UniProtKB/TrEMBL annotation, chains A, B:
Main location: nucleus
Taxonomic lineage from the root: Eukaryota, Fungi, Dikarya, Ascomycota, Pezizomycotina
Key word rRNA-binding present: yes
Pfam family, one: EMG1
Cited PANTHER family: NEP1/MRA1, RIBOSOMAL RNA SMALL SUBUNIT METHYLTRANSFERASE NEP1
Compartments in which it is found: Nucleus, Nucleolus
Official protein name in the record: Nucleolar essential protein 1
Any single GO BP term: rRNA base methylation
Signal peptide positions on this chain: none
Amino acid sequence: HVPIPPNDKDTKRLIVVLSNASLETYKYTLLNSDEHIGIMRKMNRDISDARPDITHQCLLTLLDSPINKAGKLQIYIQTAKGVLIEVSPTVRIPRTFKRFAGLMVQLLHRLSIKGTNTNEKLLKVIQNPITDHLPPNCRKVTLSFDAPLVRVRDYVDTLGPNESICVFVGAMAKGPDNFADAYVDEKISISNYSLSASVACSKFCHACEDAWDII
Amino acid sequence: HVPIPPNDKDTKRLIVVLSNASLETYKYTLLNSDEHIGIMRKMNRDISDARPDITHQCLLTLLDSPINKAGKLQIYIQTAKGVLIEVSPTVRIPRTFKRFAGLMVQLLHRLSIKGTNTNEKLLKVIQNPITDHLPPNCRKVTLSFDAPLVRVRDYVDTLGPNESICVFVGAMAKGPDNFADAYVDEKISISNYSLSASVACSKFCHACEDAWDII
């Protein structure tokens, strides 16, 4: 089986963009709420933001999803440093947050994680903006709260088989929906209650398993 | 809204039992692969088993699932020490593995986590076996690999509205399906590829959202 290459702009695919991520290597390790609680809580700036266990579990759940087993997923990470990261469908990850953390540190160091067997890279820090790396047949959407209710399976049911979709999922700290307004075609809501990025990506990706017939 | 009490044996409900868990407080903290890699790898016994990030993310995903928002979930944990733990639908959890780890340590210490506001307990270590705590209208099943393919929505579609289901999900180390043969009525498989406990519980619970009409 071969996943989606960058040569392919024909397959109806799901690009998941985790926007406004918190990948800031400080002193080398990442900024987490485990040990930097004294320096964030001491230096009085919005504790609230040392995120990456949620993008960790989005990477675990989405890269363990059956949409990865069909290969129809393509996931990007937009951070606060302006760094946009292309995460492979074929990369494997350790299940632990510490090795993921130092692996993101060396990803920010040498800007590339190569495969231990293959010639090709796996985690590739790439250019801003996202529209250089999105397909032309794209659906730039965003999960939101002020948006009215839109059912996912009816929505991608109203998407055609040539027309790929790029979702904007917020694993951010605390922010409104103006994080992506330069590149939003549509903002949708899927439930009345508050939902996280992990269960949001899981309900969306399993719903488009139900609407793309991945068995 | 009121969740399922232990008085209620009438509601068609999903009991998720995470069987063969690894909750062993050593020296106080739990046995994890982060810091005990030197003593497991040094003392040459099946590294392979310091699990609990998977039951952590099953607790996050299942206790953040919309089946919890309907209250039709009831989740138990069976460990290697013979400890069986009743996890509430109404308990909230910190999102971090360290506070979850020490919280499980004090759960094994005083055998109960009380609510910080309510009178009733939230995490209640209870008796072996599970059949004292399962409903009479029960469906003791188990996810497996040697079992033939069974579609979930057709299966619980063939379950009747008086008939609750108790699934056995393996977050174990490495083991066959004889972990539960004293209490198995049926073993099913949902996909040909290898699936984890997190995506297994998410596909099953979202599938019975599709078959129980939780909107």
